[PDB]
């Protein structure tokens, strides 16, 4: 039940991780960081600071909160 990455607990540090986030992924760094996700610097691949859950292949129409919660129901952040 532990926070997987406390260095990314800050929402501002998650936002700063989004250098070179690609245009095709459609979702914004603001929306993704607010749902607890930070950029791993590879493709559109993000990870949660809380559950360590990894998400990729983002599509227009996805919601960062909704994808995060539906795939990681154990996550305390989006619970």
């Amino acid at each position: 039940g532990h926070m997987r990455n406390p260095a990314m607990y800050s929402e501002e540090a998650r936002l700063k991780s989004f250098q070179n986030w690609p245009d095709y992924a459609h979702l914004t760094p603001r929306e993704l960081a607010s749902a607890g996700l930070y950029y791993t610097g590879i493709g559109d691949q993000v990870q949660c600071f809380a559950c360590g859950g990894k998400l990729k292949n983002w599509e227009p129409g996805d919601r960062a909160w909704s994808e995060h919660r539906r795939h990681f129901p154990n996550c305390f952040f989006v619970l």
């Binding site: 691949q45 859950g53 990894k54 998400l55 990729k56 292949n57 983002w58 599509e59 996805d62 994808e67 795939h71 990681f72």
Partner: peptide, 5 residues
């Protein structure tokens, strides 16, 4: 979006 490990 798709989870992965």
């Amino acid at each position: 979006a798709x989870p992965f490990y």
